[PDB]
């Protein structure tokens with residue numbers, strides 16, 4: 477089994493080589509990855525970062541961007557995960573196929589985010605913040621990335637205050653999702669790299 481919803485299905489043909497399995501999986505997740513690249517190019521200040529820092533932000537942050545974008549695949553009420561094919565699998569079945577604490581943590585994350593029911597504009601600006609907030613270990617011009625982060629966070633505060641003048645705490649709640657995403661990213665990378 478391959479219990480990642482970026483796949484078309486969690487079932488693996490055991491008579492395929494590791495390479496064929498990855499190739500097929502890549503045909504499923506690659507369009508999503510390319511969509512994050514096009515999204516990043518549309519953050520105006522992103523293009524002013526060095527080419528190295530652009531690539532490194534995408535390398536570190538693509539997972540967190542997609543986690544936000546695809547939080548709606550996790551239906552906490554139905555306890556189902558929708559895979560990129562549109563097929564749905566119960567949490568129980570996925571656990572029997574080898575999913576565990578990480579899947580549970582993503583449900584918890586998605587439930588809390590899904591429940592905020594952000595508008596498209598709010599979700600899009602939050603996602604920009606997520607990308608530019610990516611792990612900085614690979615970054616050559618930290619101050620430039622921090623400046624862009626600050627600019628986007630200010631825009632997000634302004635948008636949230638417009639849209640939620642009596643619930644400003646939504647802005648703080650969104651910032652507090654950043655270390656949660658970093659945790660999901662760390663745990664997920666461990667699972668990704670352990671895949672045999």
Ligand code: HEM
Nearest residue numbers: 477478479480505542543546575576577578579667668671
């Ligand atoms: C291109 C991006 C991604 C790749 C290449 C990838 C790959 C993988 C691989 C190889 C595994 C281990 C599968 C197994 O052992 O059965 C995994 C686990 C998983 N991934 Fe992904 N993934 C990606 C993005 C995402 C995203 C964006 C999400 C959430 C929206 C996600 C959700 C999950 C879940 C729920 C698991 C199982 C967690 C558990 O074991 O409890 N993946 N991923």
